[PDB]
Design an enzyme around this catalytic site. Sequence first.
Site, short mmCIF file in Angstrom:
data_model
loop_
_atom_site.label_atom_id
_atom_site.label_comp_id
_atom_site.label_asym_id
_atom_site.label_seq_id
_atom_site.Cartn_x
_atom_site.Cartn_y
_atom_site.Cartn_z
N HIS A 70 0.81 -1.22 0.00
CA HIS A 70 0.00 0.00 0.00
C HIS A 70 0.84 1.28 0.00
CE1 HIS A 70 0.24 -0.48 4.54
NE2 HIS A 70 0.46 0.81 4.44
N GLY A 87 2.93 5.89 9.50
CA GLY A 87 4.29 5.78 9.01
C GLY A 87 5.06 4.60 9.55
N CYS A 135 4.24 1.39 9.07
CA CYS A 135 4.11 0.21 8.23
C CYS A 135 5.45 -0.20 7.64
CB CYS A 135 3.07 0.47 7.13
SG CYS A 135 1.42 0.40 7.88
C1 LIG Z 1 1.07 2.13 7.83
O1 LIG Z 1 1.99 2.86 8.07
C2 LIG Z 1 -0.27 2.45 8.51
C3 LIG Z 1 -0.13 2.17 10.02
C4 LIG Z 1 -1.49 2.27 10.84
C5 LIG Z 1 -2.09 3.55 10.63
C6 LIG Z 1 -1.79 4.53 11.66
C7 LIG Z 1 -2.18 4.11 13.02
N1 LIG Z 1 -1.54 2.80 13.46
C8 LIG Z 1 -1.19 1.84 12.33
O2 LIG Z 1 -0.71 0.78 12.56
N2 LIG Z 1 -1.27 1.57 7.93
C9 LIG Z 1 -2.45 2.12 7.28
O3 LIG Z 1 -2.61 3.29 7.22
C10 LIG Z 1 -3.47 1.17 6.68
C11 LIG Z 1 -3.37 1.28 5.15
C12 LIG Z 1 -3.94 0.08 4.33
C13 LIG Z 1 -4.08 0.47 2.83
C14 LIG Z 1 -5.28 -0.46 4.85
N3 LIG Z 1 -4.81 1.57 7.10
C15 LIG Z 1 -5.26 1.25 8.45
O4 LIG Z 1 -4.55 0.67 9.21
C16 LIG Z 1 -6.67 1.65 8.88
N4 LIG Z 1 -7.38 0.45 9.24
C17 LIG Z 1 -8.67 0.18 8.61
O5 LIG Z 1 -9.10 0.95 7.82
C18 LIG Z 1 -9.42 -1.08 9.05
C19 LIG Z 1 -10.81 -1.28 8.96
C20 LIG Z 1 -11.08 -2.54 9.49
C21 LIG Z 1 -9.86 -3.07 9.91
O6 LIG Z 1 -8.88 -2.17 9.64
C22 LIG Z 1 -6.56 2.48 10.15
C23 LIG Z 1 -5.81 3.78 9.88
C24 LIG Z 1 -7.94 2.68 10.76
#
Ligand SMILES: *C(=O)[C@H](C[C@@H]1CCCNC1=O)NC(=O)[C@H](CC(C)C)NC(=O)[C@@H](NC(=O)c1ccco1)C(C)C
Length: 301
Positions: free
Chosen positions: A41, A143, A145
């Site tokens: 992503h 950030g 990830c």
């Molecule tokens: C990567 O760096 C981020 C790390 C996240 C976000 C910030 C807060 N803690 C953390 O670990 N990962 C993301 O932003 C993902 C991106 C993907 C393309 C999904 N998005 C999420 O983690 C998002 N989760 C969901 O949307 C969700 C719905 C049901 C289960 O998970 C968060 C930001 C709510």
Amino acid sequence: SGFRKMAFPSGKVEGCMVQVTCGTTTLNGLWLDDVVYCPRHVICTSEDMLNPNYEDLLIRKSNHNFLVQAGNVQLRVIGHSMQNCVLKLKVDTANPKTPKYKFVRIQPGQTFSVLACYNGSPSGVYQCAMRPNFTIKGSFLNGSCGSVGFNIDYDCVSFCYMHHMELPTGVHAGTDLEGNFYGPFVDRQTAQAAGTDTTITVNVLAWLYAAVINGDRWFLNRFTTTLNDFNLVAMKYNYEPLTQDHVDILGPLSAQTGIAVLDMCASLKELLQNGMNGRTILGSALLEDEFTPFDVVRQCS
Ligand SMILES: *C(=O)[C@H](C[C@@H]1CCCNC1=O)NC(=O)[C@H](CC(C)C)NC(=O)[C@@H](NC(=O)c1ccco1)C(C)C
């Protein structure tokens, strides 16, 4: 003496952390030999998170669109491919700090160390368990990830986790280094549901043995139990069933303390039924389940 939540030394993993920037998205990458592994992503935007088409998004990206930096040094990307939910960026320089390593898919109840990173730079290291529902209770911000989870055996780093997302719960989900998620999760912002979590019974028992080894012995009672009778009580308190395999795994701790596993099970049964009455074990007022039997033995060599 003493017992602490202890992480692996992180130096071998620190030398592998890089930063991957694609457009306005920046996350962490793992540089081993001439390949950088990172969550796919990194190629998404806001337009692209309800239901991203990752293959569509990737075809529109060049090698030059991937900015990879190891500290102050840019790494030229010469190839890119997707493997499940991770990207593999071939770079023109092999990492000179590559440790001996393996990729491992861990089992629920096993533990590992997380090196939390932002912009390719480490922030902290802590120890985590893979929960029975395939989530981890970590500490991750925006950030983070691409931060990885790992164990060390002698000179070999076993990478087992790469961080991808936070559930609205406040728990975290990610993949193995082959890009396959732990649990029924997907890398998109959709309504997914984590199963109900349970307490890792064999780990609680190992931690009770750690307590005895450290002289915290007040909870030992005079009784024994059968494995079947124990499991009937464990079930009521949302504890995992204890198997004979788990019993055998506790052999070394049972031998070191002279306490049979089924006798320790009788003491845990009483703690579950009666509570702790305001007392602590190893400084905790709750039963702890994120120490494996191996963790205990390793710490209490
Ligand atoms: C990567 O760096 C981020 C790390 C996240 C976000 C910030 C807060 N803690 C953390 O670990 N990962 C993301 O932003 C993902 C991106 C993907 C393309 C999904 N998005 C999420 O983690 C998002 N989760 C969901 O949307 C969700 C719905 C049901 C289960 O998970 C968060 C930001 C709510």
